[PDB]
Amino acid sequence: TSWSDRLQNAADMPANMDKHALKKYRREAYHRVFVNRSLAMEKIKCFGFNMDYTLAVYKSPEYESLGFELTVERLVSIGYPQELLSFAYDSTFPTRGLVFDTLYGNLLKVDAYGNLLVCAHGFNFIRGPETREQYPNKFIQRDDTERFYILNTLFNLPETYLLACLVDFFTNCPRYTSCETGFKDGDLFMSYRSMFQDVRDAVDWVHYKGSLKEKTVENLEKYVVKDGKLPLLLSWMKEVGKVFLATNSDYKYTDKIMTYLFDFPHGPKPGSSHRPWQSYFDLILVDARKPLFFGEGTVLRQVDTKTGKLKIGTYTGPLQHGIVYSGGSSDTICDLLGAKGKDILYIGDHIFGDILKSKKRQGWRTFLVIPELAQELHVWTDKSSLFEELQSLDIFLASIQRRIKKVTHDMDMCYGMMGSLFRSGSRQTLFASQVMRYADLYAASFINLLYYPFSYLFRAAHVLMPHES
Amino acid sequence: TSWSDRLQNAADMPANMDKHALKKYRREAYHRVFVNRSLAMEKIKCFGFNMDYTLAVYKSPEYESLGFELTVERLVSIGYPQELLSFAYDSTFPTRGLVFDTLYGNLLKVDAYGNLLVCAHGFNFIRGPETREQYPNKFIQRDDTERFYILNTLFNLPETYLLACLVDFFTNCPRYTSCETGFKDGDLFMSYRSMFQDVRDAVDWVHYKGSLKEKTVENLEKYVVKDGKLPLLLSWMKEVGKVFLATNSDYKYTDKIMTYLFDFPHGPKPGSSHRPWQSYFDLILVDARKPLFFGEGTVLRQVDTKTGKLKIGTYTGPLQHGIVYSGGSSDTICDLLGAKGKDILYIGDHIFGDILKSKKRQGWRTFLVIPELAQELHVWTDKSSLFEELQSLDIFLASIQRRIKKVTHDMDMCYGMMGSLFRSGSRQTLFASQVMRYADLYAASFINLLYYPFSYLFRAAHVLMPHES
Amino acid sequence: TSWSDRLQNAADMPANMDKHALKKYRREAYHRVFVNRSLAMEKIKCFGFNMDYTLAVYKSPEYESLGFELTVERLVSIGYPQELLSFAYDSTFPTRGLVFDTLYGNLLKVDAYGNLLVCAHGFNFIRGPETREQYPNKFIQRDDTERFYILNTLFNLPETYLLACLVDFFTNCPRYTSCETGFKDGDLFMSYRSMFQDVRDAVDWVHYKGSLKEKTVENLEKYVVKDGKLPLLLSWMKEVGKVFLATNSDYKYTDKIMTYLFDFPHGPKPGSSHRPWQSYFDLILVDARKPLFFGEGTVLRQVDTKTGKLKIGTYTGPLQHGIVYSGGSSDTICDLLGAKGKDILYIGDHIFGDILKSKKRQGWRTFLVIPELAQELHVWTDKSSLFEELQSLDIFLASIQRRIKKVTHDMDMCYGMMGSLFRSGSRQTLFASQVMRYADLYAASFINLLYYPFSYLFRAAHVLMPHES
Amino acid sequence: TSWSDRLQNAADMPANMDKHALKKYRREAYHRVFVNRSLAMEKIKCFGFNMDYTLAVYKSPEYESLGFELTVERLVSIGYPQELLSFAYDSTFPTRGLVFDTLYGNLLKVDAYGNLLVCAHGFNFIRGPETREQYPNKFIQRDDTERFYILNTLFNLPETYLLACLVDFFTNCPRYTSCETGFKDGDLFMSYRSMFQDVRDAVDWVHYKGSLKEKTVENLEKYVVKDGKLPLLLSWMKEVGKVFLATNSDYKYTDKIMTYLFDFPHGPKPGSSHRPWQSYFDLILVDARKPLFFGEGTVLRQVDTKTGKLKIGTYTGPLQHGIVYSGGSSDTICDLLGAKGKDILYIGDHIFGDILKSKKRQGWRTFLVIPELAQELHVWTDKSSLFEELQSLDIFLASIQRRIKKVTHDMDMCYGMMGSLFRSGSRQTLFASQVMRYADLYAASFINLLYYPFSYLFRAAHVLMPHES
Ligand SMILES: Nc1ncnc2c1ncn2[C@H]1C[C@H](O)[C@@H](COP(=O)(O)OP(=O)(O)OP(=O)(O)O)O1
Ligand SMILES: Nc1ncnc2c1ncn2[C@H]1C[C@H](O)[C@@H](COP(=O)(O)OP(=O)(O)OP(=O)(O)O)O1
Ligand SMILES: Nc1ncnc2c1ncn2[C@H]1C[C@H](O)[C@@H](COP(=O)(O)OP(=O)(O)OP(=O)(O)O)O1
Ligand SMILES: Nc1ncnc2c1ncn2[C@H]1C[C@H](O)[C@@H](COP(=O)(O)OP(=O)(O)OP(=O)(O)O)O1
Ligand SMILES: [Mg+2]
Ligand SMILES: [Mg+2]
Ligand SMILES: [Mg+2]
Ligand SMILES: [Mg+2]
């Protein structure tokens, strides 16, 4: 059972819109909205969305596997060895939010301070003492952004696994000589950095120039979660406020995906007339180029929705019914909707490009969707005794240290080879820390908002400093 | 009673070095070390210091007043109006960590997210609705570092008050016409930004080219806290590890100040021979240029300690007894002391330049001295009922809002016109948030380490995400 | 008769290799090598080439017309109006080296100092007094490189004409409202700058992603000058020194073009065995990325000449027979050929990217090919009386001014609507000035070197300052 | 006899203002204005000046010697060795326009292309073959501005000599070990680059913080050329156009110097009332910060001429009688005087900061003063036979090469150890080339304009390309 299996299972339920029944779905932690900072929902006037991995949740591991296969085929097409074709995507290896160290070719799981939690070179998990040769202080400078690449999104899962596959392959293939910073192949030297860049370029290529979008849209039922509650929730949002879409995807792809997401023989509720997807939005904006969108952005363009091409020129006109925008900036949204940042709840899956940047640059309210949480919560509750044991081992304070390392490993392995998205044993990950700091609300799915009234006061406890406690 | 009065009062006590007595001083919160992240003191191998406002705590309000007077005199000398000479420093106005908005000429107290807590234009405190004209989302982009200047250090207290004095003066002087972004004086326009830059330049000038250092060293007893426990604590540190100084001040000034700090008729304890200050340090480094120090730094130079001039050339030799360094980088410290970052506890008063930068760039352990905490703790305990009332007003949830604003104001005024360093009512300041995030330990004075054994395990509770709780 | 007709006519002659006959071809200025700075040919140890418009001279106006047609079709495909399809390339309009002013949408012919010689808005030639509104000092800041784009190469001829066609079209089409900096189309505004960028992008697109290369290679006889003397001259160069190719084109295209250039039923001379083109070069380097090539360059790669793909990795091996390089830098050439800059004669057609940059950055000796010179010389000699009259009108110095403007116009029109590449009347162009300053030698074709012995001393008179004369 | 002796000798002559007598002074090349590009003086509407080394020509070698002595004393004061105090300025060593190579510690005389003409390491003149170790192509990349510093101005003469003195001293002092890129002094390494920066900093220091200005103004007759024809010429300029001053010097110094330059017991002519210097200018601007002045400049300020301090604020008012400006940009001049660039003749001594930048950035007309030309012309005519012999040796073309090197050396030595400002033998210097390219007119002194009517047409021959000749 993958995280998307859980989400599609919950998607197959029709909404019992009885108020006591609505409250009741929160009986499961799976259906809750979690709160880092208090948020009075009655103050939200605009609900903003992105599409990819938020409205359109790609099915796992099928979609990752497709991305992986196509990225591999692109690398082979540009001259990587044929052996790459024998790789096959393994969903048990990657966890999201890992850092690829381009100097030494390691995948690292780090905390908020850049401290090393896990280090894998290919499929070799390097124990603490061995990591000290390359990381003398068990630490990386996180924002040495030329050296370290943070794999933030679900789109990065295939390349997370591929990077490890490639390092493993080249290390164990006798044609190549392993060196500190890459591989020697006679009179050719392939640095981990150049290899990484080839992988990044190939992933971008499959999405923008290759066949990934075409193959997705060919079999939407295989690749995209569909939920009749999505149009319902969106209709309720539009009754109390304004609704907008700001997607990094282009119009033609957005139209195909959104059409599928709304393709039911009814509108918001069974028995109601079907309405086009565009009717659910007061403002539709594509080619957003987030995170740049939240700064200077790009010139505002208008999409010709008949051809899917941009009209020539900068668009200087007003918000009109049926207009679709391209580019622009977050100020375009605020201006056209008559909103200030704190009147906006932006629902994002990109912790950096949606959530951190909208919060920090614009003071928007934020809702982070974390699709894996569905499965992570299951593991978290199912294996509660392991964490509980770890806590009491940490408490017990006058060997033992090695029992802590044992229990940490067993707990971590329940999630996969790279552990929980949120922690390694008792240490929180960078990702966890960024969720807490920048996501006002978070959940497995934004659909969970269906189970709360729009007057709800989401509450978090006031924080006190140690000297105040 | 100022914060420095408290510190000098505690300084006048001789250390009763009986172990039960040592533990007992922590009876007062005043003498405690506060813990944001756990720290096992037995793992610390190097204790690092800065001088200004850490080892050499300048007396308040005398030192701020001197800086203020000299900065005013410098502005008048370059052609500011004579009326500036009638200003007089008022310690009740400034709180540290405020942000000067150079566009609109406001002092702002903000939270970690850039949300406005307090806004004063001159001495006019602008209420929430009036702030919306200039700050439509009650928010600033914090790291628009060209527009906003964060007044982080105790050295910035005089200019915090002076900026408000200047805005008040020009606003109410009929020769000047108030405009949105500054003042018109016939055919001359003085922007708030150019005014701010003149103030910054004048403060730097008094410290580096003017008479402030000369006047300080003329009357050290008036201007600098002196404590016989300082040599004692430093001697205990050097028995268990290495001790270093990395100061942004120059050698001649450092030597004068440090000589005074160690001028007792004994060494570490009464009855022991006096030893020179330099003997307490394994490494002494001046002209550090923090925060650049924690990145590329500057070329390593050697001080000629007889003349106080730098020797000509880059210093390429080893660590030897009696050598004094200038410039260099944090790597100089690590290399020469045989340390990794996590073996170092750096004791700083500059939340950005000492603590945030050493933590983020190098993974050093951090101890933040907050001289005002002595007085803030007194107010915090003395007026506990006001905060308690605020908490219960916030709790009480089905008018009232205006009672919250009332009680918030009364609480805040107990600290001064700009409120507590750490909060406005129930909202934490940027400064508070940065202390929690980057200072592993903090206290009113690093001398509080005297009351803990060097095997002590400083403990903070493990943090859990909302879905984990 | 186009310039390429002259070059192909001279190309059809077999070389009479008798020494008196060889000297005799210089009887015509058409066959001479012109000298800006003295150059002793015996000191040249390496002869370097580029391919496009040097070895492979594209036929005119057929090749420009093809580029124009394909660029137009690309613009229409992205949504420019259908009327673009009625444009047809006119070789009589563009002269090379014009500057497009992206602010005001003008093509400008300028001197070395940025003084305006000609200004055309669309097909409207703006007289001197009217230019003062937009150019108050009849001057542009040349190296405001964001505003002004210099159309240096023969590849830029189609876009030179297209820019004028577009400005003319939009100006005279009633759907658009002409504004100072572009065109208004209802709620869309198309700046001259955005229009220019679309044109630049479309020209790059047709060359790198579209069908231009495919259509060229489909009909090489229509599009490329072929000359049996090319292999002869190259063989003579390789007898006295080393020969290299450094082209911005890729290997697959280079191989197709070079194969055609060498496709005769003999080698260097009639009766000799045919040899592959690669055998004429000691070093072959593609994807050069000039002008960056003459600075840091890019990593050195090796071409797999069987597949035409790059091998994976940086190439660290030596110069070997049959190796083909990609990327690298000018230092790659020097190192592998054992050359210093002044031992190298680089034969280029790009005044900036080949000639100015190799001279200024590396002190290479330079030979500039100027394909138009064949036709320009014909006009220059044929209409000598007009220039002579202008000179004597300028001399005659005590009306007249307007006769000078008349004769200047008649002279200029003999070359085309934008005049001579080298002048407008008595004023030299930027291009002329850059040829004189950076091209040690220049000619209509590098084949003209066939008519000089390799011991020849090319001589230019020593320059004296006015006070030295 | 120094160049300033010639200028002061000509300064002592009263102007015989008879028209035939005025023309007659041009009998001597010393009194001519030389022409690189034609200039119709009737079109000049504004005459612009700088002060230092143009209006105020500092006497040689006294002024250079003073700068040298004070710079040496500053270096010794910061800790350079006492032996520096035994250096004494030698006017026979430096020529202006040399390039200091900070990597290898050489003074280089180069041509326009960066080719090496002379290379001296200390006082050791390195012959051609020995230069190849450090300069393999006998070439430098001129605009590697971090490595190479061009000593353009007469203010740079002392440091030109001092750099050679320092390299010579450290090389021959047994305490120091000579290395490729500087000197080792035990555990201190002094790079040529750090040494150079210390020298540059010390020269700036003596001018802006030290005693050079004070010592100059103490003995103006010793240090500054004074000429009764200066007020006469300026008065004639103001009768036909506008006159402005744009100086990099501050107001207080400008006022002292200009007062001295105008201190005669008469105004423009004997018998006329004396007028203050300021009355000769329609616009006076100090603190110009050329060359930045010709780009964005700095904010426009107003000088309080009573105190010599700047008024607080940006000056937004109009041009009024008696106003003195500070900062601003070249656009300030154009706007306030109602001028376009080609209506302005700017009279400068800084080939880069006055002449190249005003020409290239603004299309101003340019007049370069070259104080040394007075003496260079004397040598040029006196030793004409040596150059003539060189020309005929170069002509004679079928040993000899070594006779050319001999005669080149003898010619060069007539000017000093670093040869003529304008050439080494038959090769022109960078400086000569920049004079020709950017200075429309040039002369030993701008006073030479007194000998030409303001309707004069300065004529230069039209330039032809080799193929046009
Ligand atoms: N999740 C992320 N993905 C990619 N880049 C990131 C991420 N978080 C931070 N960065 C980049 C942006 C900055 O250049 C740099 C500094 O990060 P750092 O200040 O340590 O993190 P933070 O949580 O305080 O957020 P921010 O970077 O916005 O300040 O790292
Ligand atoms: N206390 C401070 N004083 C001065 N500048 C600061 C301070 N804190 C942060 N900055 C600067 C450095 C960065 O350019 C910018 C970004 O800040 P931000 O990321 O919002 O804060 P932070 O607490 O995450 O620390 P950091 O800036 O190191 O990432 O602000
Ligand atoms: N022919 C050209 N094409 C494109 N850019 C040019 C050309 N010539 C010069 N430039 C660019 C490079 C510089 O950024 C800028 C400065 O030019 P400028 O100094 O006036 O010309 P130049 O003939 O002295 O050559 P250079 O630019 O190399 O110094 O213009
Ligand atoms: N006389 C000079 N003094 C100092 N810097 C100079 C001088 N001449 C040119 N430069 C600088 C400015 C540029 O960064 C760089 C490029 O010079 P280069 O293009 O070779 O000379 P140039 O005679 O064409 O003038 P320009 O530099 O203005 O283009 O050198
Ligand atoms: Mg998304
Ligand atoms: Mg300090
Ligand atoms: Mg070419
Ligand atoms: Mg000057």
Structural contact between residues B97 and B431, judged by C-beta atoms closer than 8 angstroms = yes
Answer yes or no: do C274 and C324 share one domain.
yes
Task: State residue B56 phi and psi, 5-degree precision.
Answer: -105, 95
How many A-C residue pairs are in contact by the CB < 8 A criterion? 74
What CA–CA distance (Å, rounded) separates A394 from A396? 6
Instruction: Give D333 to chain B, closest Cα distance, Å.
Output: 18
Rounded to the nearest angstrom, the gap between the alpha carbon of residue C116 and the centroid of all alpha carbons in its chain is 22
Distance from CA of A387 to the nearest CA of C (A): 46
One domain, residues B96 and B157: yes
Q: CA of D240 to nearest chain C CA: how many angstroms apart? A: 21
Q: How many Å lie between the alpha carbon of B199 and the closest alpha carbon of chain A?
A: 28
Burial class (CB in 10 A: 0-12, 13-18, 19+), D338: exposed
Strand order in the sheet with A124-125: A124-125, A116-121, A106-110, A99-101, A148-150
Is D24 among the domain residues?
yes
Distance (Å) of CA B108 to CA A385, B103, B111, B160, B424:
48, 12, 10, 11, 12
Find out whether D221 and D260 touch, Cβ atoms under 8 Å. Answer: no
Burial class (CB in 10 A: 0-12, 13-18, 19+), B418: buried
Q: CA separation (Å) from B325 to B246, B298, B329?
A: 9, 12, 11
List the single best residue of A445, A467, A469 to mutate versus B (max B Cβ within 10 A).
A467
Q: How far is A147 from chain B (nearest CA, A)?
A: 14
* Domain identity same for A42 and A66: no
Among the listed residues A228, A239, A227, A237, the one whose alpha carbon sits nearest the alpha carbon of residue A268: A228
Q: Are residues D239 and D351 in the same domain?
A: yes
B442 found inside a domain: no
HEC states along chain C? CCHHHHHHHHHCCCCCCCHHHHHHHHHCHHHCCEECCCEEHHHCCEEEECCECCCECECCCHHHHHHHHHHHHHHHHCCCCHHHHHCCCCCCCCCCCCEEECCCCEEEEECCCCEEEEEEECCEECCHHHHCCCCCCCECCCCCCCCEEECCCHHHHHHHHHHHHHHHHHHHCCCCEEECCEEEECCEEEEHHHHHHHHHHHHHHHHHCCCHHHHHHHCHHHHECCCCHHHHHHHHHHHHCEEEEECCCCHHHHHHHHHHHCCCCCCCCCCCCCCCHHHHCCEEEECCCCCHHHCCCCCEEEEECCCCEECCCEECCCCCCCCCEEECCHHHHHHHHCCCHHHEEEEECCHHHHHHHHHHHHCCEEEEECCCHHHHHHHHHHCHHHHHHHHHHHHCCCCCHHHHHHHHHHHHHCCCCCCCCCEECCEECHHHHHHHHHCCEEECCHHHHHHCCCCCEECCCCCCCHHHC
- Could you tell me if the CB of B407 is within 6 A of ligand 2? no
Report the CATH number at residue A296: 3.40.50.1000
Please report whether residue D419 resides in a domain. no
**How was this one solved?**
X-ray
Please, which residues have CB within 8 angstroms of residue C210's CB and are 6 or more apart in sequence?
C70, C74
Do strands A300-304 and A309-310 pair parallel, antiparallel, or not at all (unpaired)?
Answer: antiparallel
Binary contact (D397, C139; C-beta < 8 A):
no
- Please choose, from the candidates D165, D142, D8, D171, the residue with its C-alpha nearest in 3D space to the C-alpha of residue D75: D165
Q: A312 and A198 in one domain?
A: no
The single-letter DSSP state of residue D58 is: B
Residue B350: both structure tokens together: 């500059």
| Residue C60 phi, psi dihedral angles, 5° rounding | -115, 140
Same domain, D207 and D270: no
| Strand ordering across the sheet containing C99-101 | C124-125, C116-121, C106-110, C99-101, C148-150
Q: Which helix (H) or strand (E) holds D185?
A: strand D182-185
Q: Which chains touch D (3 or more CB pairs under 8 A)?
A: B, C
Query: Which of B206, B185, B236 shows the shortest CA–CA distance to B64?
Result: B206
Residues D134 and D18 in one domain: no
Which has the closest alpha carbon to C344: C46, C49, C50?
Answer: C46
Query: Which of these three, D162, D192, D218, is where a domain ends?
Result: D218
Residue C422 and residue C412 in contact, taking contact as beta carbons nearer than 8 Å: no
Find the farthest-apart pair of alpha carbons in chain D and give their distance in angstroms, rounded. 73
| Beta strands across the sheet bearing B182-185 | B177-179, B182-185, B188-191, D314-315
Pairwise CB contact (< 8 Å): C462 & D391: yes
Cβ proximity of D39 and D441 under 8 Å = yes
For residue D360, list its beta bridge partners. Answer: none
Q: Is the peptide bond before C61 cis (omega within 30 degrees of 0)?
A: yes
Same domain, C23 and C74: no
- How far apart CA A13 and CA D372 sit, in angstroms, is 94
Rounded to whole angstroms, what are the CA distances from A208 to A58, A159, A205, C367, D232?
17, 16, 5, 43, 74
Distance CA D363, CA D293 (A): 14
Q: Whose CA is nearest to atom 4 of ligand 3?
A: C150
Same domain membership, residue B103 and residue B46: no
Biggest CA-to-CA distance, chain A? 73
Residues whose Cβ atom is located within 5 A of ion ligand 5: A 50, 52-54, 349
Domain boundary among A218, A246, A267: A218
- Residue A430 corresponds to which amino acid? L
Residue C378 lies in a domain: no
Same structural domain, A365 and A253: yes
- For the four alpha carbons of B239, B241, B246 and B251, in that order, the dihedral sign comes to positive
Distance from C-alpha of D31 to C-alpha of A73, rounded to nearest angstrom: 79
Residues of B engaging A, defined by a Cβ cutoff of 8 Å: 29, 32, 34-36, 113-115, 136-139, 141-143, 340-342, 359-363, 373, 377, 380, 391, 394, 397, 422, 426, 428, 432, 435-436, 442, 457, 460, 462-463, 465-468
Residue C433 Cα: closest atom of ligand 3? 23
Q: Which residues pair with D182 in a beta bridge?
A: D179, D191
Q: How far apart are CA A439 and CA A37, in angstroms?
A: 8
Q: What angle (nearest 5°) sits at the alpha carbon of residue C309, between those of residues C304 and C313?
A: 75
- Show residues of chain D in contact with C138, CB under 8 Å: 342, 363
**The one-letter amino acid at C134:** Q
Are the C-beta atoms of B167 and B105 separated by less than 8 Å? yes
- Residue B139 to residue A363, Cβ atoms within 8 A: yes
C263 vs A35: CA distance, rounded Å = 75
A/B Cβ contact: 3+ pairs below 8 Å = yes
Q: Quote the distance between the C-alpha of residue A373 and its chain's center.
A: 11
Domain that holds residue D133: 62-218
DSSP reduced 3-state for A159:
helix
Residue nearest to atom 15 of ligand 3 (CA): C143
Q: Which of D134, D462, D469 to mutate to test the interface with C (most CBs of C within 10 A)?
A: D462
Q: Is C432 part of any domain?
A: no
Clarify whether residues B108 and B210 are in a common domain: yes
Number of domains within chain D:
2
Q: Tell me if A295 is assigned to some domain.
A: yes
Best residue of D169, D197, D312, D323 to probe chain B, by most B CBs closer than 10 Å = D312
Interface contact B113-A359, CB threshold 8 A? yes
CA–CA dist A466, B440 (Å, integer): 11
In eight-state DSSP terms, residue B282 is S
Closest CB to B436 among A139, A342, A465:
A465
Cβ neighbors of B253 (< 8 A, separation 6 or more) are B213, B217
Q: Do C467 and D34 touch (CB under 8 A)?
A: yes
Q: How many CB atoms lie within 10 A of CB C42?
A: 12
In this complex, the residue of D32, D442, D467 whose CB is nearest that of residue C29 is D467
The verdict on a CB contact (< 8 Å) between B113 and A363 is: yes
Q: What is the resolution of this structure in A?
A: 1.7
Closest A-chain CA to C302: A188
Which residues partner with C88 through β-bridges?
none
User: What tokens were used for C14?
Assistant: 């077999």
CB distance B363–A115 less than 8 Å? yes
A397 occurs within a structural domain: no
Report the DSSP beta bridge partners of residue C150.
Answer: C99
Question: Which of D100, D108, D111, D143 has most ligand 4 atoms within 8 Å of its beta carbon, as the pocket-test mutant?
Answer: D143
Cis peptide upstream of residue D466 (ω within 30 degrees of 0)? no
For B155, residues 6+ apart whose C-beta sits below 8 A from its C-beta are B52, B53, B67, B203, B207
Strands (E) located in B192-299: 242-246, 283-286
Atom of ligand 1 nearest to the CA of A357: 28
Protein residues with C-beta less than 5 angstroms from the ion ligand 6: B 50, 52-54, 349
**Looking at B333, B367, B401, which one is the last position of a domain?**
B367
Please give the torsion angle defined by the CA atoms of residues D306, D312, D317 and D322, in that order, rounded to the nearest 10 degrees. Answer: 10
Are C75 and C213 contained in the same domain? yes
Alpha helices in B219-356 (DSSP H): 220-223, 229-240, 251-261, 330-337
